[PDB]
Amino acid sequence: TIVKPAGPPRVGQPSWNPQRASSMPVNRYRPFAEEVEPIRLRNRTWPDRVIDRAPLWCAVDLRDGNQALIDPMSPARKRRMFDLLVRMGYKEIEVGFPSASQTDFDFVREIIEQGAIPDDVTIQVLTQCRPELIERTFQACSGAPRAIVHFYNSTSILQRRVVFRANRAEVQAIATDGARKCVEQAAKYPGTQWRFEYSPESYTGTELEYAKQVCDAVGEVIAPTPERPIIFNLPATVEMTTPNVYADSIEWMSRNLANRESVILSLHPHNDRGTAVAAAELGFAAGADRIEGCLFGNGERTGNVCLVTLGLNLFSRGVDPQIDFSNIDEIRRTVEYCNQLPVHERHPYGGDLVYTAFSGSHQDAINKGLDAMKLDADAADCDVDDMLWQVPYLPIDPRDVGRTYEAVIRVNKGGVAYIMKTDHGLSLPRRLQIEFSQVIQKVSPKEMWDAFAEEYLAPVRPLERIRQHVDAADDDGGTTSITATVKINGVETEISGSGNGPLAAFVHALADVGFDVAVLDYYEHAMSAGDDAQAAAYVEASVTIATSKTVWGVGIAPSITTASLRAVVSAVNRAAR
Amino acid sequence: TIVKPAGPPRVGQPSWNPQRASSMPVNRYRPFAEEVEPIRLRNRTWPDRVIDRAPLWCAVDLRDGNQALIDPMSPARKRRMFDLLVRMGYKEIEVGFPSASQTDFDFVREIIEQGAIPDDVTIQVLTQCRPELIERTFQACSGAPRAIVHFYNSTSILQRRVVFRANRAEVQAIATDGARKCVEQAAKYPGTQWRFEYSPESYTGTELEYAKQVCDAVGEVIAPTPERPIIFNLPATVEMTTPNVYADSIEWMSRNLANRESVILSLHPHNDRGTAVAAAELGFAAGADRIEGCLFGNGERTGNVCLVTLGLNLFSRGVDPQIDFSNIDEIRRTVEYCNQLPVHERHPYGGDLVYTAFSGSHQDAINKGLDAMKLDADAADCDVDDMLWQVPYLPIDPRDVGRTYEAVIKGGVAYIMKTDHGLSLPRRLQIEFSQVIQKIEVSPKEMWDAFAEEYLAPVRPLERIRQHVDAADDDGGTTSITATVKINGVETEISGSGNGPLAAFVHALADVGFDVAVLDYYEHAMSAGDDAQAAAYVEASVTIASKTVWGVGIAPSITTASLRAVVSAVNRAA
Ligand SMILES: CC(C)C[C@H](N)C(=O)O
Ligand SMILES: CC(C)C[C@H](N)C(=O)O
């Protein structure tokens, strides 16, 4: 159980701080400077640098993220993850560890053999330095027009001591021999353009002078040039300290590595201390050229730096990430499919709750910011969606990620969706729950229902539907025509249209009378069991009356066909409120 | 949908970077220096400062957290959260906004009347500046032996302009009148040790000179002393930029505020950019005294800074957080219960996977590390458990937080059908179909042929050729149907009536020995547009002259889609 800290306060601890020494065994842990080495960089320049271009991005989802899963990816999930990364615009993709995993081997064969790799994409494969594992890495890759062989070995103070029980020259030689084997294998395969990446694995627990020594030594072997450079990848395999010390280390490495013009400086931060995004951002500022990571932070334990957070962290401060995130829910769905692990509710940019507001004053402020943007657009004759986003509490326009701002209204166990289904038998499409909470925002169960009926069910002006005649074609693929008796602002009129179904027909019938309903989406469900249940239909439409608003329509009827036509009328009249 | 970036690379972009420009509207966003202002700070020292003591913690779970919740806390859940925070060792605890929330108001009354505050615990209540909201706040604390009164008003360039439509002097007066009110109310409420906190709300979006001037001014009103300090709380209401810049801002504020010995400088990071922890850590190194956050990062949108992450980031680097995390499961289980939101699997220290190693290589290193630790403990006659933790891949001993090192040794139907096929299968159809498929890995193409084979292709025992639907013109009228069908190859006319086309069709089926007891029904568009196709889903118990089935029907017509989903169900049944 948890017991209240009860030791004396520190010596010199101020009077206004009543905290107590805990009995946590801090003696078992040391400051990073004593665990590893003091990193002094008093002339650092990274704190004075604001990032202004995308890094070279490398997605490791298919290796590092895969390694990390309760259920590793099936051949299908591998392939889906691969096509998402390509389609988002990543150019370096680490596709597996084929010398260590027959399923990685099969996967790399597949993508080579079936032409899944675009000509601007370089596949990357991980290997350890054992020469036969390196041989089989090249074999995996046979037929690739180009590939990065990523080789590595652990170089930490603690691993050299207790894992390898090895000296500095011995641990360096693992890597130089690895490098040598890479050079000889590349020459045995002139059909692939080969590139190299070397990681001093557990870099963050390694002396920087030794990290430099091993990398320089590896570079001497590979012999890279400005046109044919090497990636030195510097991982925080364990994130051991604050991101500034990581940054200081990258700046030192950037200035001190031999042959710096023939180096792509790559970062690979983990998240043990919760600051993996900060390490990537600070370390990029420090002179790195490239960042390895995963969509939504997937990877071993606390994960790899999140490539979504890093990309939109650029977008939202005016830098093009060079990666498409304009449908973040498609990315999220694909990612959760592949990894079979949910993105958290509060995950930056992509979590369920991140475009929500629960505070009444946040809501009021957001509405004023939105209004003031809309006034400025009319003045400038511009589309508000093209202008400087200026809205309190929302770092970005959610529309720019295919998401919607949502004010969440508490209903006096609860919530709109929930009381609507339970007490009224309506399962409201999510974007209908959004739009209607916006209405309540301008509450008890009864108040919400009354408001709901006011917006969606009761209105009869400008459009009312009295009756209609549906002529459905008997033959599949045939035309449906409709004549309907409608009142337009109380005036009885006769409307007619045709379409591939009854909703299409009724939509074309209304166009002739000055209501343009451009239908975006449609849902329907029974309100009970039995062939004679009521049908509730929901229609999303961008509607124009003789400017255009997106609104929802709701209709309820004994007939599935009719419930759908009611929804349309509902929609039309909602657009006029 | 996601469209591959195709725009020209930037001028000067290296040859080794084949990345293309995205079509994201980056011109709607400006660098921070231009949205707000460039960095004021000359000679920063936070970069060379390594944290060696714990800050003063304040838990804002009961207000800032609670306000964030889909299901807000019951009185029981609050009490449970209050008690957890106390027991962990928190001395400052935000308990409500009682002036704006009656349930907040009750809670405060309750713990004051119940005598539930330990003598070392200060409660904190939030108010806005309006004089009536201040008085209601002091009334809620009526009788408290000590309390923090946190008043705030928004100061950002953006909110002055579009929220308050107010100039700098106006907004400062909102603040200093609040403080005046607080002073007056403090004087009308005897014997309680009233303590103040002022936040220039939306601080990261405010000019530094201006935030300092507002703060100085409020401090001149409170007239705090080193014995009775004021709290100035400087929130990243939105986390707007990198943590180094926040920290530059805090160092500047620390060096420049008036009456610095009477000031407890407080940080309130949010996580919009995923860097709230780093903002807190760099910021505390920059000279702050105090940090407000939530257990496991709860709070609006992306959340407040994680209190757990921060204290355990001190612990694992040899610094006492002065808070007990010896049993993080208990913390996590209580937090999830109070919040009714889960700690993510990857959450530092707390999450399901953070002491798990799936790699054989890692698992080997781990044992090599633990064996070397044992060797050493045996040498010195020591408990391993009291020795320097030296284990690759594991920053802490999972036993140090109540946890254990774990060496670990769907077909995706919903996702695939919807992505590849435009179908949102009902949940029970999802279950039913993925049963069919666990028996049949199956490729997405394979899963398609299997589905079409079950639900789409069968024309026996039932095939619908065509039908005439005589729909009721008038709401509530009968709909009739006549259909030409084939029953195991045999052309038959069926006909029937009911309250809609699906009832008409099910009535007709019944004459021909096909009893369809409809249990549920769904329909949706497969695309945007009034001419989209409909997918319809019908669940029935079917008696073919009582099997529970789904049918799926697809058609350009809403009506006809529904009829096909009937036929599909009948054939499923057989
Ligand atoms: C899918 C639905 C929007 C409409 C369908 N095309 C019909 O008219 O019935
Ligand atoms: C809601 C559905 C189960 C059926 C509706 N009574 C119709 O016949 O169209």
Ligand SMILES: [Zn+2]
């Ligand atoms: Zn890694």
